[PDB]
Design a protein around this nucleic acid. Structure first.
Lengths: 154, 395
RNA sequence: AGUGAUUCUGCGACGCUUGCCAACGCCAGAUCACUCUGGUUCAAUGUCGGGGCGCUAAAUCACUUGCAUACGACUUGG
RNA sequence: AAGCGUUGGAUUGUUCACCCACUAAUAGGGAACGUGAGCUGGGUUUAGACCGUCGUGAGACAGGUUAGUUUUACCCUACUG
RNA sequence: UUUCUAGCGAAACCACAGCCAAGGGAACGGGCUUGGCAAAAAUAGCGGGGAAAGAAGACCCUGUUGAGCUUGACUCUAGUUU
RNA sequence: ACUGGAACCGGUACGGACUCAGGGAAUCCGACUGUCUAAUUAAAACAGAGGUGACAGAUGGUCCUUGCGGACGUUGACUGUC
RNA sequence: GCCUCUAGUCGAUAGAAUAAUGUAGGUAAGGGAAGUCGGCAAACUAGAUCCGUAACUUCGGGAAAAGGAUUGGCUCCAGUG
RNA sequence: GCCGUUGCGACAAGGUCGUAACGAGUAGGAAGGUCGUGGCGGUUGCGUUGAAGGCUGAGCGUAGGCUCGGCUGGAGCUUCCGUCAGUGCAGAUCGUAAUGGUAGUAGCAAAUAUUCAAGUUCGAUCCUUGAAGACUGAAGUGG
RNA sequence: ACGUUUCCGACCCGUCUUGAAACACGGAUUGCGGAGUGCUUGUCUACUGCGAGUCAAAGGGUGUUAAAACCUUGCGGCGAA
RNA sequence: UAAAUAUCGACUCGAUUGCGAUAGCGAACAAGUACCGUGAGGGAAAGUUGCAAAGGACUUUGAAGAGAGAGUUCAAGAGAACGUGAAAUCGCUGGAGUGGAACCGGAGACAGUUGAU
C-alpha cells in the first residue's frame, strides 16, 4: 500500500521487501534500520543478532532524548545507543523476506548489499489511560512501515 | 536584606571545581627552587600507600608538657621500591614559558616501562622503541644522540630525568610501570646532564632522595566517594525534620537578582578523587627492603629487640606485604591503600622547630589490622596461646 | 661549521644561467582601436594514474581487576 | 582600610525590644522590605465558635481568643558534577 | 524508588525564542543601544530566573448588574380582628 | 484442672517474640455519655438532665391545605407545644 | 497478636546495579529540649501475682494514682473432688 | 526621469493628449478597481485529443490578483452586459477536524516470592504437569 | 525569484491606551466555517416615468412556455389651503 | 344555518434566482439510532472502488500479518479504511550552511534559469 521512497539503479540485479503497519516503535526501528545502511546482507544479519545478544549497540542519532550511555557506543562515534530487540526481530524478518525474493529472482545471495532502507510512521493505534481526578488521556501506539532494497554488488 | 546572624561560608572556593582528577597519577605542579651550589640530587619519588599503624616515640621538645615523655603517634607506610632512570629531558625558557627541547631515552628500556605506551600490550606486537634502540648502535644515530646531549647541555635551563617504577619485584597483578619527570637540582646544567647520562638505565634508591626527620610533600588523588549531596560534599546544615521534598539540601541557592545561580553555591556532585598536594609530612623512618640482610628486621627499633618486619600480623589489609624500601610518614596520607603517591621535597625553607626535631622511635606496632590485634608476632601469639588441636593432630 | 625565542646564516664543491661594446648589424615579431590574461599571471590544497628510495602498527568490543563508578568514564591482566 | 570575624540563650509570631552569659568584637545595611514549584505556617488573611463595646436588627470592630487543604518541573537557561 | 536495560508509553505548557553588565524605555529586557563575549552532540542533578504553570482577582473600586438576610425604608400581600 | 511453697540449674535477659497507659502539679472552657460543617474548622460550638416563664379546659391552643379537609390527637394540665 | 492443618493463592511488567534526593523502617558516643511558635515527631510506660497509694471529693470516686518486689527451666512438697 | 492627484487646456471623446503645481497620516469619509467569490436573465466560447480541483517553471500588474508551461485528475467549465448576494479572515481563552516540540521522556515502585525439570508451541518469567520454597491463616486470599 | 555569502538597516503581531518590544492581555501548528443582516417606518441624496396631478389597493377580465405578462377604478393614498 | 376565511398537523401532488455532506431538518447512511442520565431528558459521527467484481487464479518466503512475482482493468499509483488527495507534521537521497536564536528589507557576487533577425 505504501510506495517505495526510492527505486533501484537497475531492477534486474536487485530485490525489494516491504512491511506495513508493523506494531513496533517507529523511533527504535528507525534508528536500528539506519544503522544498517550500506551493510552487506550477512553483515546486517550478524549485526542484528549481535544487537539481540547485547554484543553490538544501535546508535541513536536522532531520537536520543534521555537515552543512556554505554561502552559499545564508541564504535559508532556517538555517546548514546540502545539494543532494540523487537526492532531487530522485525528487521530480521524483513531481511529474510528480501533474501527469499532474491532467491526467487535467481540472484547470488552471497553478494547482496543493502542499497536502500527506510522506515516511515504509520497510522497510530488508540488506547486509554486513566489519570487522577477522573480524567482520561490517550495511550497511543506508533507503528511503522519498513522497506528495503537489496542490490547485487560486483 | 542582610542575613540576621553571620557565619563563614561552607568550604574553600580555591579547591573548586570538585571534579574528578584529570589523571590517576599525581602531577607535580612545582619543583623546589634549584640551587647550583648543592650536590646533584633528585627532587621527587614515587611510592604506594601501604597502610597505617602507630608508634611510640620519645619527644624532645623543650618547654613542652610531653618533653622527655613517650607519646603514641599514628603513621603511614609508603612502600618505595627503587626507580629506574630511563631518559633525560630539558626545558628552555621562552616568552611563553619553559618548553621541552629534546628527550634522550636509554638504549634498553624495560618491558614494564614500555608497557606504559600501550593499552593492549599483550595483544600488540610490542614495537615501541624498537627502531630507537638501534639508533644507539648506529653511526648516524649515535651522532644524533650526541647532538641531543649537546643541545641539552647548551640551551636548557632545567633538566629532568624520566624515571619509572619497577613492578615485577612487587609480585602483584599490575605490570605496567609508572613514568614521571623528576627535576634534577644541584650543580650546573652541564653537570646535571652528565649525571643523568651516567645514571641512565640505573636504579635510584629512596634513601638517596630523602633523609630522615625531613619534611616532604605528598601529591596525589584523594579517596573517591562518587556522587554526593550537599550535606556531605560541602557540609551544610541539615534542614529541619519537617521539611517537605528533602532536608539534605541547601534551602536557598540564590537571591532573585542576579537572576542566575552563582558558582559559589553548594551543589551535589562528585566527592573525592581530587588532586591534592599536602605539605609538611615528617619522615619518621626510612626502612630498607625486608628481603635484604640490612632490612631483615625493619619493623624493630633500638629499644624493641624483637625480630619483626614492618608488615603487620597477617599482611597489610587490602594491600599485601611490604618487602621493599619504605618511608614512615607521620599522620595521614591522601588516597586509599595501594594508591600511588608522589613524594616531593619541600619548596619551603623549613624554619619551625618541628622540621628539625629528631625522631626517636621506641616501638612500632605490627599487630593485625583486621580485627583487634592482640599480638605483635606470630611467634608471640603461638607462645601465648600454647598448642592447639591442629598441632596435636599434626603430631 | 654555526645559529634554539627552528628555522635561518657563513664557508666551500658542483651544475643552470647572468653584464657591456661593434649593434638594432642581421633574422623573427603584426590578431585590424581598448574592454579578465603579464595577452598561458600566481598560490593553496583534494583525488586518480605511473615510477624512485622506503615501513610492515594500533585502538576498540567482550571478559578480567577494584584504588573507580548513577550510566559513560577511571585503574589493571591475558 | 570591607581581607577576615561579628556568637549561646529566657519571654514574644514578632522585625524591634529587654535581660542572662561568653567573647577580639558582639558594627550597620543591600540583593523584588534577597530567599514559600526551598521549608514552616506561629502571625496576618475566608467560611465554625467565644467575649467586650457598638447596632432595634441582620451585623461591625489595625479589639482580644480558639481551630482552620501550602499544588506542578520531565521544558529553556543558569549552576553542579 | 530514582539509576541502566527489554517491552510499553502519556500529559501540562508553547508569539518567536532562550549567556550577561549598564543605559534608556510602560520608571525591574532574551530581543533595542554601548560594552563583556561567542564552538558539536549529550547523561545525572538542581530549584536563581523564564515578573514559570494552574484560574477572565474570591481583596479594593466602578456598574443607574444581582442574590441571601434584617428592619423604624417605599409599595403590597396570606392570615387574622372588627 | 487450678492454687501456694521449697531445692537445684543458666544467662547479657525469664510478660526473653507477640500483644498492651509514661507519670505528676496547676490555670481556662464545657458538668458528664452524646452530636456536628460528607471533600481544609470535632471545638469552648449543638444536645443534654435540671431551672424558670408563656399560652391552652376542647364552642380551646399551635400548625398545614387553593379548597374540601387534615396533624399534635388512640391526646386532656403529673397533658401539649413554645 | 504470632506460627500451623483443610481449602486457596504466588495475581500485582520483568532483569542488572545499589549514585545523589526521596518514601518507609532500624540504630547511635557524651549532653538531654540548648531545637522549635510550640517536646511536632520519636523515645519512654505497659501482661500477671504480692505490697502500697496523696490533695481533693457531689462520699460514688480520684486509682492502673504515685511507687516497689516477683516472673525462665527442672526435680519435688501441700491443698482443692 | 517616471507614476498618480489637482487645476487649466486641445482635439470628432465613458477617450486620448498637453501643461503647471503638488503627493505625511490614526479614528473617519468618499472614489476607482478588464481585484476576487456564488447565483439569475442574456450573450461569447472551451471540453475524455482531458473540465473543475491539486502541486509548481516563464511572465504581467504599484497592489488586490491574472495569464501561460510542466505533472496529477477524470466531467465539467467560461467571456462580456445588467442585476442580485449566506461575497474575501491571522487573531475573537473563536467553532470543528487533524497534527507537532515536549518524548521514547514522566512513568508502569502498596498488598513478603519465587526457583528447578518437563509438556505444548514457529514462539513460554506469565499456559499446563511434577518437585521445592513461601503466603492468606477459620472476624480467610476458604465454602 | 523563499539557495549560499558578504556590506547597511532590522525588537512580535492584534488590541485597549497619553504612552507597548514590554515584566499588559489573546496567539503551539494547519485546514475548513466565522461577524453591520432582514423587514417596517422616516429623512436626504442620485437615477427613471408622468406632471396639477401621480400611484393606484383589494377585486374583476383574460392568459396553458397560467404564481408571469396584458387590460381594467364616480370611489382610495399622497399632492393641489 | 352553507359560501367567501384560517391551516400543510394528516393523506396525495407540482415547483424553486434556496443548501450541496462543518451546508441543508438533529438525521442524504441499520437517526431520534449508538451512547449518556435514576429520572424529567440529552443526543452524535457516519455520502463516493470500477462501465462491469472482472474484488487479484497461480508460483514463492513466512506460523501469520504480510511481502516478491503474476493476473484483471481505459486505468489500479482506482485493491477493499478503495474518486480526487491540499496544509500542518514527518522519513529517505543529493547539495549547501552551521561560535548564545532564527527569520526579514535594500545592494551586489556566486550557483542557477532563461532569451538571442
Amino acid at each position: 500500500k505504501v510506495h517505495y521512497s526510492r527505486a533501484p539503479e537497475n531492477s534486474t540485479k536487485s530485490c525489494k521487501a516491504r512491511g506495513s503497519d508493523l506494531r513496533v516503535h517507529f523511533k527504535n526501528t528507525h534508528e536500528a534500520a539506519m544503522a544498517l545502511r550500506g551493510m552487506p546482507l550477512r553483515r546486517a544479519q550478524a549485526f542484528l543478532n549481535h544487537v539481540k545478544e547485547h554484543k553490538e549497540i544501535v546508535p541513536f542519532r536522532r531520537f536520543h532524548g534521555g537515552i543512556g550511555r554505554a561502552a559499545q557506543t564508541k564504535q559508532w562515534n556517538t555517546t548514546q545507543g540502545r539494543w532494540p530487540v523487537k526492532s531487530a526481530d522485525f528487521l530480521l524478518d524483513l531481511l529474510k523476506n528480501a533474501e527469499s525474493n532474491a532467491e526467487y529472482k535467481g540472484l547470488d545471495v552471497d553478494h547482496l548489499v543493502i542499497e536502500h532502507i527506510n522506515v516511515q510512521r504509520a497510522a497510530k493505534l488508540r488506547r486509554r489511560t486513566y489519570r487522577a481526578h477522573g480524567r482520561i488521556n490517550p495511550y497511543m501506539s506508533s507503528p511503522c512501515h519498513i522497506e528495503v532494497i537489496l542490490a547485487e554488488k560486483e | 536584606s542582610h542575613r540576621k546572624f553571620s557565619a563563614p561560608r561552607h568550604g574553600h572556593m580555591g579547591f573548586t571545581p570538585k571534579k574528578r582528577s584529570r589523571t590517576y597519577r599525581g602531577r607535580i605542579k612545582a619543583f623546589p627552587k634549584d640551587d647550583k651550589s648543592k650536590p646533584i640530587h633528585l627532587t621527587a619519588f614515587l611510592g604506594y600507600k601501604a597502610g597505617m599503624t602507630h608508634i611510640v616515640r620519645d619527644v624532645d621538645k623543650p618547654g613542652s608538657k610531653v618533653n622527655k615523655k613517650e607519646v603514641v603517634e599514628a603513621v603511614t607506610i609508603v612502600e618505595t621500591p627503587p626507580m629506574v632512570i630511563a631518559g633525560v629531558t630539558g626545558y628552555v625558557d621562552t616568552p611563553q614559558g619553559p618548553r621541552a627541547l629534546t628527550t634522550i631515552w636509554a638504549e634498553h628500556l624495560s618491558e614494564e616501562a614500555r608497557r606504559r605506551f600501550y593499552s593492549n600490550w599483550a595483544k600488540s606486537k610490542k614495537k615501541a622503541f624498537t627502531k630507537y634502540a638501534k639508533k644507539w648502535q648506529d653511526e648516524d644515530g649515535k651522532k644524533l644522540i650526541e647532538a641531543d646531549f649537546a643541545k641539552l647541555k647548551k640551551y636548557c635551563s632545567s633538566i629532568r630525568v624520566i624515571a619509572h617504577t619497577q613492578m615485577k619485584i612487587l609480585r602483584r597483578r599490575q605490570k605496567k610501570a609508572h613514568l614521571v619527570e623528576i627535576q634534577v637540582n644541584g650543580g650546573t646544567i652541564e653537570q646535571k646532564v652528565d649525571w643523568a647520562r651516567e645514571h641512565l638505565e640505573k636504579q635510584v634508591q629512596v634513601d638517596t632522595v630523602f633523609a630522615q626527620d625531613e619534611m616532604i610533600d605528598t601529591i596525589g588523588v584523594t579517596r573517591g566517594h562518587g556522587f554526593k549531596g550537599v550535606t556531605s560534599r560541602w557540609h551544610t546544615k541539615k534542614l529541619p525534620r519537617k521539611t517537605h521534598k528533602g532536608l539534605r539540601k541547601v534551602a536557598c541557592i540564590g537571591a532573585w537578582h542576579p537572576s542566575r545561580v552563582a558558582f559559589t553555591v553548594a551543589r551535589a556532585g562528585q566527592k573525592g578523587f581530587h588532586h591534592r598536594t599536602i605539605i609538611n609530612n615528617k619522615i619518621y623512618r626510612i626502612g630498607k627492603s625486608a628481603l635484604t640482610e640490612e632490612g631483615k628486621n625493619n619493623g624493630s627499633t633500638e629499644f624493641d629487640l624483637t625480630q619483626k618486619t614492618i608488615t603487620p600480623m597477617g599482611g597489610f589489609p587490602r594491600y599485601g606485604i611490604v618487602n621493599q624500601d619504605y618511608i614512615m610518614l607521620r599522620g595521614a596520607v591522601l588516597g586509599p591503600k595501594k594508591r600511588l603517591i608522589t613524594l616531593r621535597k619541600s619548596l619551603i625553607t623549613q624554619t619551625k622547630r618541628v622540621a628539625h626535631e629528631k625522631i626517636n622511635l621506641k616501638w612500632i606496632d605490627t599487630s593485625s589490622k583486621t580485627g583487634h590485634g592482640r599480638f605483635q608476632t606470630t611467634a608471640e601469639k603461638r607462645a601465648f596461646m600454647g598448642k592447639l588441636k591442629r598441632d596435636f593432630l599434626a603430631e
